[PDB]
Amino acid sequence: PTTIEREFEELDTQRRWQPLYLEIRNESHDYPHRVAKFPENRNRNRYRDVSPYDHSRVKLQNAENDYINASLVDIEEAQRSYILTQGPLPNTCCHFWLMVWQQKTKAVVMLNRIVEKESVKCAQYWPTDDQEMLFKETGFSVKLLSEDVKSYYTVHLLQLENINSGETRTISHFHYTTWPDFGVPESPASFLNFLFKVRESGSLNPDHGPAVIHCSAGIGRSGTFSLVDTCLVLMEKGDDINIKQVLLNMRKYRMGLIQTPDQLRFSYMAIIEGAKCQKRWKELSKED
Numbered sequence: 001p002t003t004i005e006r007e008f009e010e011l012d013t014q015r016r017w018q019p020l021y022l023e024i025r026n027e028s029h030d031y032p033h034r035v036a037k038f039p040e041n042r043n044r045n046r047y048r049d050v051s052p053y054d055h056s057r058v059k060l061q062n063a064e065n066d067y068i069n070a071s072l073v074d075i076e077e078a079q080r081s082y083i084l085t086q087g088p089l090p091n092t093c094c095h096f097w098l099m100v101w102q103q104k105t106k107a108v109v110m111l112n113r114i115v116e117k118e119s120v121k122c123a124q125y126w127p128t129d130d131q132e133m134l135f136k137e138t139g140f141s142v143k144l145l146s147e148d149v150k151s152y153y154t155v156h157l158l159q160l161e162n163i164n165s166g167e168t169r170t171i172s173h174f175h176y177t178t179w180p181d182f183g184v185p186e187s188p189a190s191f192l193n194f195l196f197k198v199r200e201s202g203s204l205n206p207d208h209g210p211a212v213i214h215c216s217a218g219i220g221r222s223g224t225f226s227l228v229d230t231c232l233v234l235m236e237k238g239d240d241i242n243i244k245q246v247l248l249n250m251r252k253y254r255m256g257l258i259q260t261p262d263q264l265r266f267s268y269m270a271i272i273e274g275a276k277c278q279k280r281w282k283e284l285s286k287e288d
């Protein structure tokens with residue numbers, strides 16, 4: 001048994017999952033988020049209590065208002081960087097794609113549905129048919145090139161076009177459609193099969209900008225996705241990681257990563273199961 005599997009069992013048999021989560025909540029460093037609280041930025045925030053820190057927020061270069069609810073999560077020991085953002089609002093979809101272009105982002109990971117429990121969690125920021133989606137405020141257009149519908153997720157091939165310079169770029173849109181809000185995936189196998197499909201696409205490689213991970217608020221399910229992938233990269237280096245400390249370090253870049261104790265427990269399960277690294281996952285996932 002590994003040092004992660006022994007801690008997992010002790011946390012399970014002793015029922016210490018919620019106190020561990022409360023420890024992470026209390027040990028979380030608070031940082032200034034003044035730009036997010038400006039009066040001009042009220043219509044750019046989906047939730048009042050979810051704001052990006054000033055020191056790590058992503059800036060929209062050369063725009064009149066450079067604010068977007070997006071945080072750059074840097075893990076130097078892992079050579080990995082993610083942009084965790086909220087589900088775009090109808091008026092910030094143009095800022096979302098300007099950010100994707102400026103940061104040279106290759107992949108967009110979506111872990112939420114457009115509609116969840118009688119509420120819209122994210123605007124339809126990519127086209128569903130062959131019609132062009134225009135974003136004139138930032139001068140961008142998005143076309144749906146191809147889509148691959150699996151059982152519990154869909155991969156869209158999107159063409160992001162700079163309508164001013166004519167330059168186009170292909171974007172891989174991974175849409176996890178069966179991850180409930182404030183909940184966990186069906187199994188560690190279905191999540192790891194999705195995470196490794198993102199890895200196998202080369203869109204997390206250093207030849208690209210940071211991938212954009214987003215759900216509804218960009219801290220709950222997005223934090224669970226980011227913590228597992230970061231830990232799986234750190235353990236490949238040969239480090240005996242402390243999952244609690246890796247999460248608290250990530251929480252210095254964006255507040256409230258991982259929202260429920262069950263999401264934290266699932267992170268331990270996915271890290272333990274993913275540590276053994278796959279074809280088994282694809283079959284257990286039942287994506288076909």
Ligand SMILES: O=C(O)COc1c(C(=O)O)sc(-c2cccc(NC3CCN(S(=O)(=O)Cc4ccccc4)CC3)c2)c1Br
Pocket residue numbers: 025028029030031047048049050121180181182183215216217218219220221222255256257259
């Ligand atoms: O993806 C999911 O699973 C769920 O996604 C979701 C939502 C959805 O999908 O509908 S809503 C939502 C939400 C909206 C407002 C406030 C809070 N909760 C607050 C609680 C307090 N925290 S915090 O980070 O603990 C505040 C803090 C900052 C720094 C230091 C200490 C505390 C912010 C979020 C959560 C989250 Br999350």
